[PDB]
Design a protein around this ligand. Structure first.
Ligand code: MET
Length: 518
């Protein structure tokens, strides 16, 4: 089915200024979006801010300023951070937005009409910092920041409190079987697999009903009112999750402002999300609550939820590191250094180790070799002679790469996609070392044509598949190689030989990645 490829980040709480967690989550969203764009697909990538709730209102109170000002300020800081980080996100949604509120009311009303919301009580533990209902089995002993004996969340370690409120309740328990059906009929819908198994175990154990409203006093009146009952406010998570539906219905002008909210999601061909990028901290909300609401409303379910090993919500300022080491290089590091775990060091030592080893010595070095006036004397893509068996072994690696990288990108598993490309980059280097084209300029010009052509084509194809990771440096590489704009995109240009011999290199200047001291 030809739709617009719809990829989302989580919308982030605005109690705190943007930090690495949000930058990471949004980077993953950005890269997926970019890969589908290089593949020639229509893409709508979404990110934003989660502005309502007790948590934010209390953070505004601490800073001594109104919630409206506070959210607008911090939202602004987030907007600036993502511009600074050089993403290509199609739209930035805010839950304070009027059109968003409309969609929340629409969805609430649908759920109520369908018999799935009732008036009840929630009596139990609650983490305000996670905005999460917790059972007794998920709390434990700990300290508040006075240093006194309190209860804290097993999930997060944040301070929990007992809540006894009359609340609108969503009948989540009535959706246990349909959710389990969904997980089994769609075994790739939650990634990575061990997190998919975690969700399934939880839902197999049983589901309580979910409190979807809170009394307005408790939220400091900083939330969306329940339709037909202004004493209650909508649960910041139903509010929050609904951003995805809202985003799928907004028309956006060339400057990135929302101009129109369409009635039917099908008009824009975005809903449901093809990929939801989230941290492991919010898995239950996206894999249990969210599809249950969609099932109730008769709305389509997302295709994939990918949960990474970071708690999205000792300084590590990404804007600071990007200025020291390069923007693309930092993005490369974050995506290369860890797959689905915290485990993998985020040290200057290892950052330099990858910058030097992979970006400079593997990729950078190879680009200079195949473009230098020393080796490539005519400044062009030469026409190759006959291929040896060793030539063909390298060519096969280059030919097989796009299909392999495609699968990894679609999982999605961006670390594996990068490793797959660099495996081919390592191989190309080995080939160049073996063939020694610097010697071949004098000895065997006919052979050099073949060696150089293969190297150039390897560098192009690898660079194309790396262009979602290194969006700026890929443009620099393509300019040096002299690759016409039209060949920097599309599935057709994944194929070997797409740039013809005789193509002239771009003018010389420079380095791509400068090595750094240890
Ligand atoms: C609908 S995604 C909500 C994410 C949440 N605001 C967080 O910061 O974890």
């Amino acid at each position: 089915v030809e739709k617009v490829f719809f990829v989302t980040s989580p919308i982030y709480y605005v109690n705190a200024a943007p930090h690495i967690g949000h930058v990471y989550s949004t980077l993953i969203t950005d890269v997926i979006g970019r890969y589908h764009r290089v593949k020639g697909e229509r893409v709508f990538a979404l990110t934003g801010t989660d502005e309502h709730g007790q948590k934010v209102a209390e953070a505004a109170k601490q800073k001594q300023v109104s919630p409206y000002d506070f959210t607008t300020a911090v939202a602004g800081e987030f907007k600036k951070c993502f511009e600074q980080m050089d993403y290509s996100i199609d739209y930035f949604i805010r839950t304070t937005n009027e059109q968003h509120k409309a969609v929340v009311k629409e969805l609430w009303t649908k759920l109520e009409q369908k018999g799935d919301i009732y008036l009840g009580r929630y009596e139990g533990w609650y983490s305000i910092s996670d905005e999460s209902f917790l059972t007794p089995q998920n709390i434990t002993d700990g300290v508040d920041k006075d240093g006194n004996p309190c209860k804290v969340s097993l999930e997060s370690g944040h301070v929990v409190t007992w809540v006894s409120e009359e609340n609108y309740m969503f009948r989540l328990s009535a959706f246990r079987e349909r959710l389990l059906e969904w997980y089994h009929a769609n075994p790739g819908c939650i990634v990575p697999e061990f997190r998919r198994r975690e969700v399934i175990r939880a839902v197999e154990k049983g589901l309580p009903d979910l409190s979807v409203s809170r009394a307005r006093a408790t939220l400091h009146n900083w939330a969306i009112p329940v339709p037909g009952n202004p004493d209650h406010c909508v649960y910041v998570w139903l509010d929050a999750l609904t951003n995805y539906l809202t985003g799928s219905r907004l028309r956006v002008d060339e400057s990135g402002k929302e101009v129109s909210l369409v009635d039917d999601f099908n008009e824009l061909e975005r809903f449901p999300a093809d990929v939801h990028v989230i941290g492991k901290d919010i898995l239950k909300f996206h894999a249990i609550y969210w599809p249950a609401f969609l099932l109730s409303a008769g709305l389509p379910l997302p295709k994939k939820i990918v949960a990474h090993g970071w708690w999205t919500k000792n300084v590590f300022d990404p804007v600071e590191k990007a200025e020291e080491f390069g923007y693309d290089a930092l993005k490369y590091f974050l995506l290369r250094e860890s797959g689905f775990s915290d485990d993998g060091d985020y040290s200057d030592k290892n950052m330099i180790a990858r910058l030097n080893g992979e970006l400079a010595d593997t990729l950078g070095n190879l680009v200079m070799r195949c473009t230098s006036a020393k080796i490539n004397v005519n400044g062009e893509w030469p026409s190759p002679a006959a291929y040896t068996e060793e030539d063909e072994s390298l060519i096969q690696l280059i030919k097989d790469l796009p299909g392999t990288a495609d699968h990894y990108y679609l999982i999605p598993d961006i670390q594996k996609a990068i490793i797959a490309v660099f495996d081919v980059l390592r191989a190309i280097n080995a080939y160049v070392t073996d063939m020694a084209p610097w010697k071949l300029v004098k000895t065997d010009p006919e052979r050099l044509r073949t060696v150089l052509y293969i190297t150039l084509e390897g560098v192009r194809v690898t660079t194309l598949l790396l262009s979602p990771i290194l969006p700026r440096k890929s443009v620099v590489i393509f300019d040096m190689l002299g690759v016409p704009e039209v060949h920097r995109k599309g599935i057709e240009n994944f194929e070997f030989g797409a740039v013809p011999p005789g193509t002239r290199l771009g003018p010389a200047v420079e380095v791509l990645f400068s090595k750094r001291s240890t």
